[PDB]
Amino acid sequence: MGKGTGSFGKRRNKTHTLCVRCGRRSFHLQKSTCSSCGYPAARIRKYNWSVKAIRRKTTGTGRMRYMRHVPRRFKSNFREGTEATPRKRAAAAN
C-alpha cells in the first residue's frame, strides 16, 4: 500500500548515524560525511547564513575557556614568592 502508513512501517535502513566529533546523529553513512561539522574534513563546517540557534550550539557551553583565559590575564609567564614559612616571614602585611 501507499503513503504515510507504509512509509513509516518499513524503516529498516539507516542513513544518519552518530558522529564522533560533534555527538549528533547527522553522519551520512553511505557518503561518509557529517552534515553538522564534517567528520572527515580538514575544516569544521561553518556557515554564516545559518543564524541564531545553530551558531550558538557550535559556540559551545561544555567549553573550557577558563584555562585559556588565565594567560591572557597575566600576560607575563612568571612570578615567584614562597612567603609563609616559620620565621613569620612577610605573610601578614600593612
Binding site: 548515524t17 552518530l18 564522533v20 555527538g23 549528533r24 546523529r25
Partner: protein
C-alpha cells in the same frame, strides 16, 4: 548478529541510563531553594532518544 556492538553508541546508552535517574531529595536543601524537578529523566515508551 550482535545488537549494534559499536562502542560510541554503547557508551551513550550507558550514560543516558545513568542520567535517567530521579533527583535525590537532599540536594533541594543544598541549592538554597528552587524546585529541582530534574528534566533530563526521559522514559523509553514516549519520545525518542537521538544519538
Amino acid at each position: 548478529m550482535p545488537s549494534h556492538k559499536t562502542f560510541r553508541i554503547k557508551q551513550k546508552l550507558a550514560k543516558k541510563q545513568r542520567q535517567n535517574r530521579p533527583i535525590p531529595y537532599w540536594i533541594r536543601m543544598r541549592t538554597d531553594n528552587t524546585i529541582r524537578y530534574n528534566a533530563k529523566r526521559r522514559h523509553w515508551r514516549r519520545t525518542k532518544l537521538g544519538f
